[PDB]
Amino acid sequence: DGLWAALTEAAASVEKLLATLPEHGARSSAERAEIAAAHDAARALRVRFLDTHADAVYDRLTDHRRVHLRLAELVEAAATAFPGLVPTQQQLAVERSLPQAAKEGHEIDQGIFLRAVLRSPLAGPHLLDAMLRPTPRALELLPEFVRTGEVEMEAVHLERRDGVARLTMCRDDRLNAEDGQQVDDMETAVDLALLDPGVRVGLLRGGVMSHPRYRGKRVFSAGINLKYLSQGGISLVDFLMRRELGYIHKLVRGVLTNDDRPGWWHSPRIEKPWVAAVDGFAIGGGAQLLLVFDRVLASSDAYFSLPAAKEGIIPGAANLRLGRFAGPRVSRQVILEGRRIWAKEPEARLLVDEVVEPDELDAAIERSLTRLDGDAVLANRRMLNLADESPDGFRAYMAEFALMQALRLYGHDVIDKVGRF
Amino acid sequence: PRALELLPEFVRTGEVEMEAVHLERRDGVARLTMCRDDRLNAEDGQQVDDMETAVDLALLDPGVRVGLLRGGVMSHPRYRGKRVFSAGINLKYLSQGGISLVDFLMRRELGYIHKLVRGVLTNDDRPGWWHSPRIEKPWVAAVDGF
Numbered sequence: 001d002g003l004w005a006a007l008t009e010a011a012a013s014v015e016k017l018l019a020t021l022p023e024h025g026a027r028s029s030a031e032r033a034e035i036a037a038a039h040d041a042a043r044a045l046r047v048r049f050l051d052t053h054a055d056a057v058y059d060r061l062t063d064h065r066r067v068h069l070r071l072a073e074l075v076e077a078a079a080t081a082f083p084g085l086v087p088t089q090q091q092l093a094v095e096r097s098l099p100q101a102a103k104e105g106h107e108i109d110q111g112i113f114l115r116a117v118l119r120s121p122l123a124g125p126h127l128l129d130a131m132l133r134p135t136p137r138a139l140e141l142l143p144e145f146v147r148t149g150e151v152e153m154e155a156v157h158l159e160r161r162d163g164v165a166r167l168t169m170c171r172d173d174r175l176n177a178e179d180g181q182q183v184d185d186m187e188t189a190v191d192l193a194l195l196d197p198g199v200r201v202g203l204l205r206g207g208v209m210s211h212p213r214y215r216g217k218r219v220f221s222a223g224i225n226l227k228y229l230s231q232g233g234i235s236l237v238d239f240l241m242r243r244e245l246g247y248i249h250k251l252v253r254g255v256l257t258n259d260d261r262p263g264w265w266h267s268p269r270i271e272k273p274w275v276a277a278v279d280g281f282a283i284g285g286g287a288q289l290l291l292v293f294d295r296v297l298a299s300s301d302a303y304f305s306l307p308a309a310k311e312g313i314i315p316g317a318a319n320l321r322l323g324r325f326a327g328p329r330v331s332r333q334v335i336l337e338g339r340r341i342w343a344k345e346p347e348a349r350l351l352v353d354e355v356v357e358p359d360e361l362d363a364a365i366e367r368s369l370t371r372l373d374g375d376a377v378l379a380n381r382r383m384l385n386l387a388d389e390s391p392d393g394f395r396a397y398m399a400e401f402a403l404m405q406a407l408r409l410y411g412h413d414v415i416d417k418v419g420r421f
Numbered sequence: 422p423r424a425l426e427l428l429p430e431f432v433r434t435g436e437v438e439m440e441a442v443h444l445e446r447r448d449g450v451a452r453l454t455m456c457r458d459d460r461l462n463a464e465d466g467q468q469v470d471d472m473e474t475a476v477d478l479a480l481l482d483p484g485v486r487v488g489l490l491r492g493g494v495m496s497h498p499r500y501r502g503k504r505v506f507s508a509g510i511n512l513k514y515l516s517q518g519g520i521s522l523v524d525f526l527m528r529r530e531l532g533y534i535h536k537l538v539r540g541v542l543t544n545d546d547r548p549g550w551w552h553s554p555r556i557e558k559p560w561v562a563a564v565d566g567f
């Protein structure tokens with residue numbers, strides 16, 4: 001062994017250099033290379049330690065796979081139980097108060113950690129189940145939602161109507177640009193939709209925009225908030241990983257419930273079909289969402305892009321899912337070269353089921369919702385999703401993604417590009 | 422007659438600013454920009470007169486080889502900073518009685534639009550008129566917005 005002691009020392013060297021060296025941006029090139037080498041030695045040992053000890057580390061935190069912990073709770077418990085393995089809440093607060101260009105990149109350690117956890121065939125599936133459980137916030141709001149049929153959240157408006165959970169993304173000043181709060185609202189709303197027995201089908205649509213160039217027009221998504229990303233407010237764990245393992249995965253697989261109802265022995269998760277309706281455009285994170293719906297409609301003037309081909313972060317699980325929809329040539333055109341796909345071109349039918357003129361779209365959305373009601377759709381979409389995306393495939397991708405995306409979140413090309421927005 | 426009047430200054434200057442159209446000779450191209458920035462280039466009697474005048478100038482100017490029709494940058498708030506080709510006839514003026522059967526609807530078809538196809542019929546005043554009594558040139562259209 002000896003890896004823990006080596007890691008502890010290498011982390012100490014890093015903290016000693018951060019204490020003595022000048023602040024980021026005031027460092028000379030020799031000072032910059034010295035701290036960079038210390039970060040590298042420490043992170044190298046984080047990997048080597050977890051290569052052999054990940055399962056034991058995870059077992060301590062979750063009582064040998066007997067307590068389900070979500071991502072935030074997991075990395076926070078790992079910080080206190082294994083100092084130096086991942087950053088503390090206090091170290092993260094310091095990072096979070098800095099712009100991305102000035103951060104030391106302590107989230108990378110969380111990427112290292114979550115990679116090793118998701119790579120384990122024992123710990124990985126367990127963490128994924130934990131993220132499929134209902135959020136506490138949703139369980140809290142569920143009784144009022146059952147009664148009222150309505151919840152107004154900061155980034156999402158949810159309404160039960162005619163057996164449909166109508167999620168409207170309503171950040172009318174910024175084209176529904178995504179942030180940590182949008183993810184929390186989306187997961188809460190998705191949780192409510194799935195837990196509400198009066199909901200049979202879900203609908204995701206963008207609301208009416210108010211920014212002057214789009215006033216009176218609906219817009220689906222302009223993707224991640226690039227301003228916040230530049231400013232330090234995009235969290236690796238609480239945004240980039242949370243959305244993939246939480247609400248987006250619940251759209252596919254449903255919510256894992258307790259053994260508290262009949263039939264749980266054949267359906268431990270409650271899943272329902274989802275419809276997406278795209279107004280204006282779906283960009284980045286919003287386009288990623290479309291790879292997970294049972295039905296996708298778009299207005300005739302809409303387009304779909306994952307535009308950050310030169311200097312962007314990985315487009316979530318698009319790299320996992322797009323090849324299945326579009327094949328390897330088109331997926332590389334979209335992701336490697338930033339090809340934008342328009343709702344009216346033939347290849348839009350790889351991503352969209354129905355393209356409709358603006359004046360006929362509302363009615364076409366309503367028709368689509370009535371077609372997905374039965375028990376037959378539920379069984380069939382479960383079998384399809386199982387065939388389309390294996391547990392191992394999703395897990396193995398999200399394991400590498402945790403580290404690869406962490407690195408991209410701190411890449412100089414990304415920081416530079418995002419600052420110019 | 423308006424075009425013949427403006428032709429010498431256009432040959433000299435390479436530029437004419439009209440109410441509904443901006444015309445510029447550049448690199449042998451007659452660049453017609455439809456520039457009613459407040460109403461998405463909605464058409465009226467004056468637009469037709471400007472269009473025909475510009476088309477006439479493009480065809481008569483020996484320094485022009487190819488014509489280009491494009492919409493200019495709009496200033497209306499829903500389209501500010503964006504080019505728009507044409508929103509068609511001015512429906513407000515049509516309601517108000519200001520769309521002329523002869524001077525708009527017939528004039529545009531028999532004048533500038535037909536000159537885009539067939540050119541301008543000139544006098545017998547140049548070599549070759551016996552085989553080409555009309556001067557025609559090729560035209561490019563670039564459609565922004567709609």
Ligand SMILES: CC(C)(COP(=O)(O)OP(=O)(O)OC[C@H]1O[C@@H](n2cnc3c(N)ncnc32)[C@H](O)[C@@H]1OP(=O)(O)O)[C@@H](O)C(=O)NCCC(=O)NCCNC(=O)Cc1cc(O)cc(O)c1
Nearest residue numbers: 173174175177211222223224225226227284285314315316
């Ligand atoms: C979409 C546009 C072409 C629209 O062009 P215009 O019609 O000229 O609109 P704008 O006036 O820019 O937009 C209106 C308004 O919203 C603001 N806006 C628009 N999009 C954004 C984003 N993405 N962030 C922040 N603010 C935004 C814009 O600044 C204006 O607000 P003011 O500054 O207050 O004037 C343009 O706004 C644009 O390029 N937006 C950014 C698109 C983009 O590159 N998004 C990021 C793509 N990358 C991801 O999503 C990455 C990602 C997301 C994920 O969810 C997960 C993951 O793993 C990775």
